[PDB]
Design a protein around this ligand. Structure first.
Ligand SMILES: N[C@@H](C[C@]1(C(=O)O)C[C@H]2OC[C@@H](O)[C@@H](O)[C@H]2O1)C(=O)O
Length: 255
């Protein structure tokens, strides 16, 4: 408990954001959000100090054809970060190469679209071509479709990848702008959809959850921190703190 832990993260509202201030902010103070509040709580419970670095390449983490990982996942593999604290989705393929705490938040893939249409499910998207749909390129949602053996999701992946230049987007902001200004539905995690729909009363989640998973803190395989982090997350849940943090960043208060 002396060396400063390096934490890798990624910009994604309301998890991780640049704090605004009339005066200059330095180091960790530049960042705010649900995950920064979480990290602070974890650091208090476990008694460590930390240095927040964005993932250099700006990516969550995916495998290329040669099987090579990038993004926050690779930062951990290569021991360039001690922890990843982000909306980092716990997946089977990632568990092969990094360890995750128990989840601090649960979510599933769902659909962000506008209100007032006859679209009620992924099946409604899949059976037509007029409304475009896609996902953020190279994250867990995209990979879910790429790897699905379910007929509907296979059809959807065929659509997304055949029209990849338009259907797949670079980040959440691009995807939301597409929903706002074109006839487009974004495949998106339910937690992130909820943030958006609270802030724009024209937008809605369409249908239910397409899968069921969690965000967890990532560590390099074998890290002693992983189980300690799980214990801390369990404590925060027990204390009602995870609920309070969600309400602070999704609803409003407090503050
Ligand atoms: N959390 C995902 C990344 C991503 C997704 O693939 O869904 C990218 C971006 O997509 C929109 C929304 O789901 C947000 O939480 C982000 O999650 C991951 O860990 O790969």
């Amino acid at each position: 408990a002396n060396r400063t832990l390096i934490v890798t993260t990624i910009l994604e509202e309301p998890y991780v954001m640049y704090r605004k201030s009339d005066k200059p902010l330095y180091g960790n103070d530049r960042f705010e959000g649900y995950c920064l509040d979480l990290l602070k709580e974890l650091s208090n419970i476990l008694g460590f100090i930390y240095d927040v670095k964005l993932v250099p390449d700006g990516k969550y983490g995916a495998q290329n054809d040669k099987g090579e990982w990038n993004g926050m996942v690779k930062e951990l593999i290569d021991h360039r970060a001690d922890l990843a604290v982000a909306p980092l989705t716990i997946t089977y393929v990632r568990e092969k190469v990094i360890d995750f705490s128990k989840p601090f938040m649960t979510l599933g893939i769902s659909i962000l679209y506008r209100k007032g249409t006859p679209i009620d499910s992924a099946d409604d998207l899949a059976k037509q071509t007029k409304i475009e749909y896609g996902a953020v390129r190279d994250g867990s949602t995209m990979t879910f479709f790429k790897k699905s053996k379910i007929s509907t999701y296979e059809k959807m992946w065929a659509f997304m990848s055949s029209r990849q230049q338009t259907a797949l987007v670079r980040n959440s902001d691009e995807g939301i702008q597409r929903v706002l200004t074109t006839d487009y539905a974004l495949l998106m995690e339910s937690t992130s959809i909820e943030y958006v729909t609270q802030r724009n009363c024209n937008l809605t989640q369409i249908g239910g959850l397409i899968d069921s998973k969690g965000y967890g803190v990532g560590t390099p395989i074998g890290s002693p921190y992983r189980d300690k982090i799980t214990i801390a997350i369990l404590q925060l849940q027990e204390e009602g703190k995870l609920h309070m943090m969600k309400e602070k960043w999704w609803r409003g208060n407090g503050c």
